[PDB]
Every structure is written in structure tokens, then in C-alpha cells.
Amino acid sequence: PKPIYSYSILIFMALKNSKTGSLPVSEIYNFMTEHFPYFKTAPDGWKNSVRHNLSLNKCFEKVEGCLWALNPAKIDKMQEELQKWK
Ligand SMILES: [K+]
């Protein structure tokens, strides 16, 4: 049962559910496997898809196993994208 969601939306859920708005890459996996059981048995490559969407989407920024944080300037746009698909 694939989630009716994009990878950027799923990453946005994991990061906005963080108290600091930032998580390491391993925590994003744990969030997706916990809240969406499809990824527990999904074929390999979705973990690589998460790292691609982190680098490609401007909403996620690398802080300087690192951490990925939400860009406050892109939260309103990603939120509106979240609501459309809820
Ligand atoms: K990025």
C-alpha cells in the first residue's frame, strides 16, 4: 500500500514533527517506517530517494550523519502542499 504522498511531503512531515525542525537522515527513515508501514517492506531505493529529495528540494537545508533542517522561508509553501494531499 504505497502512500498517497510525495517524498518531499513525507520528509516535510518528519522534520516538522521534530522539536527543532531538524533531524538526521536516520530519523527520517524511522519516521517514515513508523507512520507509513509501506516502507518497512518497500523495495530498496526509497532511502536513496529520500537523500535525493533532501538535496534537490530547497525546503530542506543542510546544517553545518548530519542534520537536515526546514527552511523557514519555504514552510508556508510546503504546508499548503501538505494540506492539498491530506
Ligand atoms: K537542498
Curated annotation (Swiss-Prot):
Outcome, altering L56P: In TLIND; uncertain significance
Subcellular location(s) per record: Nucleus
Tissues where this protein is expressed: Expressed in thymus.
Variant or mutagenesis effect after changing R51W: In TIDAND and TLIND; severely reduced transcriptional activity as shown by a transcriptional reporter assay
DNA-binding region(s), chain positions: 2-86
Entry coiled-coil feature ranges: none
Disease link: T-cell immunodeficiency, congenital alopecia, and nail dystrophy: A disorder characterized by the association of congenital alopecia, severe T-cell immunodeficiency, and ridging and pitting of all nails.
Reported function: Transcriptional regulator which regulates the development, differentiation, and function of thymic epithelial cells (TECs) both in the prenatal and postnatal thymus. Acts as a master regulator of the TECs lineage development and is required from the onset of differentiation in progenitor TECs in the developing fetus to the final differentiation steps through which TECs mature to acquire their full functionality.
Descriptive protein name: Forkhead box protein N1
